[model samples]
Target: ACYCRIPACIAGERRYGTCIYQGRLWAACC
Candidate 1:
């Protein structure tokens, strides 16, 4: 669950958005 929570997402981590596919987090930069 790499993208389980936003704390880890918007926590000064990834510069792009996230997406869950097949129970996984993918960095979908739009």
Candidate 2:
């Protein structure tokens, strides 16, 4: 599958781009 989706990262939305690592939410943009 060569299909790739862009990030839904928003500046005002903290819920966006929230990564779950080991049970914690980490901000990952890169």
Candidate 3:
């Protein structure tokens, strides 16, 4: 896989689909 194939994570968009980075618990980044 490549960077282009991946998606950036946010809050709710964390559950958008692909992989990203680290995060915390009990937050909007589901």
Sort order, lDDT high to low: 1, 2, 3
TM-score, every prediction = 0.36, 0.32, 0.18
State the lDDT of candidate 2 residue by residue for 1-30, as single tens digits. Answer: 111123443344433244665666565443
In candidate 2 the C-alpha lDDT for residue 4 amounts to: 18
Supply every candidate's count of residue pairs whose N, Cα or C atoms clash at under 3 angstroms: 0, 0, 0
Q: Candidate 2: RMSD over Cα atoms?
A: 8.8
Per-residue lDDT tens digits for candidate 3, residues 1-30, read 222122344433443234435552232234
- Point out the higher-scoring one by TM-score: 1 or 2: 1
Top candidate by TM-score: 1
Q: Please give the RMSD of candidate 1 to the true structure.
A: 6.2
> For residues 1-30, could you state the per-residue lDDT of candidate 1 as single tens digits?
234343355545553566776777666432
Clashing residue pairs in candidate 3 (N, C-alpha, C atoms within 3 angstroms): none
Q: Give per-residue lDDT, candidate 3, residue 27.
A: 23
After superposition, the stretches of candidate 2 with alpha carbons farther than 4 Å from their true spots are 1-16
Clashing pairs in 2: none
lDDT of 2: 0.42
- For candidate 2, what is the TM-score? 0.32
